[PDB]
């Protein structure tokens, strides 16, 4: 059993995904995607809500899988507040960079996921005491996916950056 934040985010993504099946992707994208038009810049939810949208069953499964594994591990070891903050920083910044790369029509939790992969691995290397670590077997496949990248390429790399950064900052204190 994984903590409340790990579960809340899995239920958010499932609720949204189900809505995308009923209403169709575009209808949901219209309301949850990153602002496509500056006029919309004050619709604050969009800097986060892009993360909740998935486009195929494999897309959701693969993301929630990693998120359960890694998110739950952060929540278990470092608390619910830590995972909230990793989520919010990484969703917002991976979104920001993904938009710049390729515009606003993107979604998926893998920005947050690559940030979690980055955080868990660095934090496990420089602070083995935290009780979190990523197997090199996983940091390998993680790297294999990256280079394989319709992927949100800016999200993957921005998320990863964010997760390394935060892990370093937290590994110093």
């Amino acid at each position: 059993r994984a903590g409340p934040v790990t579960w809340v985010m899995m239920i958010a993504c499932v609720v949204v995904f189900i809505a995308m099946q009923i209403l169709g992707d575009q209808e949901v994208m219209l309301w949850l995607a990153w602002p496509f038009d500056p006029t919309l810049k004050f619709e604050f939810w969009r800097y986060f809500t892009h993360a909740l949208m998935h486009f195929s069953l494999m897309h959701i499964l693969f993301n929630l899988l990693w998120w359960w594994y890694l998110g739950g591990a952060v929540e278990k070891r470092l608390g619910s507040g830590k995972l909230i903050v990793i989520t919010l920083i990484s969703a917002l910044l991976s979104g920001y960079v993904q938009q710049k790369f390729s515009g606003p029509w993107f979604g998926g939790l893998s920005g947050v996921v690559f940030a979690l992969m980055g955080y868990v691995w660095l934090r496990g290397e420089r602070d083995p005491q935290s009780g979190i670590y990523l197997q090199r077997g996983l940091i390998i496949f993680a790297l294999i996916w990256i280079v394989a990248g319709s992927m949100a390429n800016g999200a993957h790399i921005a998320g990863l950056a964010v997760g390394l950064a935060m892990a370093f900052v937290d590994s110093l204190n």
Binding site: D25, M29, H50, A51, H54, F55, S56, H59, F62, N63, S94, Q98, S102, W105, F106, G107, G108, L109, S110, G111, V113, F114, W145, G149, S150, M151, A152, N153, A155, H156, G159
Partner: peptide, 5 residues
Amino acid sequence: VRMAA
């Protein structure tokens, strides 16, 4: 549309 992956 791009899948963040």
